[PDB]
């Protein structure tokens, strides 16, 4: 039976949340994942906060109805828009990805000059400089909106020549700075990390916040006595509001999970 | 209104956790209590360790703390559960964070744990590790000489090199790729341990993950301060303030600190 195992829920606009899933699979191999990507409504990047929060709640309600024991808002715009409201209203633990990436960045920097890549809405929220300066008021933080990146990732062309061109064109400004650490402030961006790293070179630490987010999941599950303790067969479930085949093609590449269950759903 | 993060320990080891808090949480004030007059705790009764740990807890709670770190492996193993249950502030120890850090660092899931005889005999690390990944392999090794090498200031010297080489040779016959420093004194030896173990082994200073978890929990509860203006750290010991200050001002790079002598229990 699967009745004892309760899933950790993850919500995101598309495939980006899988960068957190990957580190959860590694750090918490006994935990079941329920994932929902709102592919039909991706991009969230250029949407208004009120709308993002509304959509984020739709995703949350879908997974809460399926019995999850914890929720990860594996999406930067969604975190900025709705984390506190959702944390406050739910009874289960709820985290986002902005604070973990902030902590990781501060740990990686040598000169306290941090760059942030994200969407239009993430950049406009100022969530990263606010979080970063909240931990260390002396850090310098400069952010760059990369509206093309999610399109390249969602179209599955994140290893292609086009990806290489879009990265080089979007990131050239960073080379005018002394920034030594760059936060991937959209959860889609680690799919491009090899290209970003090759472009920026060995002097810049490129931060995928998935590892730090997954450690926070582990820490909170242990703290609240919520770690799974059963031998029941793990049955992960992926849900998308778009096409299942394209989701599977990307997810199977990123996670190495050949026998994945991916279903289409309708929200809103 | 500004409240400290509290740290309790049997002695000076816990200052290696403080060091990472100073780095990661520069806005936060720390109150640290080392019960050097009754250390080590490791050979004492679990009930007794728990009693002493509660006396330190009560002392800092009276001073105004918003979070407590039991910065001691022995005390974490003996009283964390009870203190967390009874207090209304977040309480953590160093074992779960070091275990998490190891599981992040390992590539082959073969982990070593270095500690005092008490800590290793408690099985606290294997319990924590296997509770996260039941397939992990864990080799525990008590290293009774290390605390002395650290506290005597020999931790960089040929003495430390020899003691480390002698103490850790059994691990060379394993395929471990990750070693937890499961005594808070041991980060002072980390460079020498890394050299002995070589570049294929991740050596974990669990103070780093501990500090991250403090940061995370403060954030979760909306208790992260925004400035280091008017920070006033306090250090307390039941033993010699001078020997403590000598150690602490070095390890924390804090020339001007004040160390207060206190009386606990009896
Ligand atoms: Cl965008
Ligand atoms: Cl803990």
Curated annotation (Swiss-Prot), chain A:
**Domain of life the protein comes from:** Bacteria
The record's annotation in SUPFAM superfamilies points to: Aspartate/glutamate racemase
| Positions that bind substrate | 12-13, 44-45, 76-77, 187-188
Q: A biological process (GO) annotation for this entry? A: regulation of cell shape
Catalytic residue positions: 75, 186
Alphabetic keyword roster? Cell shape, Cell wall biogenesis/degradation, Isomerase, Peptidoglycan synthesis
In the UniProt record, does the keyword Isomerase occur?
yes
> Catalytic activity annotated for this protein?
L-glutamate = D-glutamate
Which GO MF terms are attached to this record?
glutamate racemase activity
What's the Enzyme Commission number for this chain?
5.1.1.3
Q: What class of enzyme is it?
A: isomerase
Q: Could you tell me which Gene3D superfamilies the record lists for this protein? A: 3.40.50.1860
Record-linked InterPro entries: Asp/Glu/hydantoin_racemase (IPR015942), Asp/Glu_race (IPR001920), Asp/Glu_racemase_AS_1 (IPR018187), Asp/Glu_racemase_AS_2 (IPR033134), Glu_race (IPR004391)
Q: Transport: present as a keyword of the record?
A: no
Question: Pathway, per Swiss-Prot/TrEMBL?
Answer: Cell wall biogenesis; peptidoglycan biosynthesis
Family to which the UniProt record says this protein belongs: Belongs to the aspartate/glutamate racemases family.
HAMAP family found in the cross-reference section: Glu_racemase
Q: What does the record give as the function of this protein?
A: Provides the (R)-glutamate required for cell wall biosynthesis.
Identification of the protein by name: Glutamate racemase
Can you name the source organism? Listeria monocytogenes serovar 1/2a (strain ATCC BAA-679 / EGD-e)
Instruction: Output the lineage of the source organism.
Output: Bacteria, Bacillati, Bacillota, Bacilli, Bacillales
From Swiss-Prot, chain B:
Specify which residues bind substrate according to the UniProt entry for this protein: 9-10, 41-42, 73-74, 184-185
Alphabetically, the GO molecular function entries are:
glutamate racemase activity
Short name of one Pfam family for this protein? Asp_Glu_race
Domain of life (superkingdom): Bacteria
Catalytic center residues: 72, 183
**In the Enzyme Commission scheme, what number(s) does this protein have?**
5.1.1.3
Fetch the InterPro entries from UniProt: Asp/Glu/hydantoin_racemase, Asp/Glu_race, Asp/Glu_racemase_AS_1, Asp/Glu_racemase_AS_2, Glu_race
Its UniProt entry gives the catalysed reaction(s) as: L-glutamate = D-glutamate
Name of the top EC class for this enzyme: isomerase
Q: In which pathway does it act?
A: Cell wall biogenesis; peptidoglycan biosynthesis
One BP annotation, GO: cell wall organization
Q: Does the keyword Isomerase apply?
A: yes
Show the Gene3D superfamilies listed in the entry: 3.40.50.1860
Q: Which UniProt keywords apply?
A: Cell shape, Cell wall biogenesis/degradation, Isomerase, Peptidoglycan synthesis
Q: What does this protein do?
A: Provides the (R)-glutamate required for cell wall biosynthesis.
Q: Which HAMAP family match?
A: Glu_racemase (MF_00258)
**Similarity section:** Belongs to the aspartate/glutamate racemases family.
Q: What is this protein called?
A: Glutamate racemase
What is the protein's species of origin?
Listeria monocytogenes serovar 1/2a (strain ATCC BAA-679 / EGD-e)
């Amino acid at each position: 039976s699967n009745a004892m195992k309760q899933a950790i829920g993850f919500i995101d606009s598309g495939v980006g949340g899988l960068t957190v899933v990957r580190e959860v699979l590694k750090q918490l191999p006994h935990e079941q994942v329920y994932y929902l990507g709102d592919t039909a409504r991706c991009p969230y990047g250029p949407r208004d906060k009120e709308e993002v929060a509304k959509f984020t709640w739709e995703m949350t309600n879908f997974l809460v109805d399926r019995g999850i024991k914890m929720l990860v808002i594996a999406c930067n715009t969604a975190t900025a828009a709705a984390l506190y409201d959702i944390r406050e209203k739910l009874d289960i633990p709820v985290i986002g990805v902005i604070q973990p990436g902030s902590r990781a960045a501060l740990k990686a920097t040598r000169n306290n000059k941090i760059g942030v890549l994200g969407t239009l809405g993430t950049v406009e929220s100022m969530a990263y400089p606010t979080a970063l300066k909240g931990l260390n008021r002396r850090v310098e933080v400069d952010s760059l909106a990369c509206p093309k990146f999610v399109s390249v990732v969602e179209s599955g062309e994140y290893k292609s020549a086009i990806a290489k061109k879009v990265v080089a064109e979007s990131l050239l400004p960073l080379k005018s700075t002394k920034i030594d650490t760059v936060i991937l402030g959209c959860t889609h961006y680690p799919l491009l990390k090899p290209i970003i790293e090759n472009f920026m070179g060995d002097g810049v630490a490129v931060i995928n916040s998935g590892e730090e987010t997954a450690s926070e999941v582990s820490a909170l599950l242990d703290y609240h006595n919520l770690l799974d303790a059963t031998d029941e067969e793990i049955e992960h479930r992926f849900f998308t509001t778009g096409s299942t085949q394209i989701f599977k093609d990307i997810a199977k590449d990123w996670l190495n999970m050949p026998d994945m269950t991916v279903e289409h759903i309708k929200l809103g």
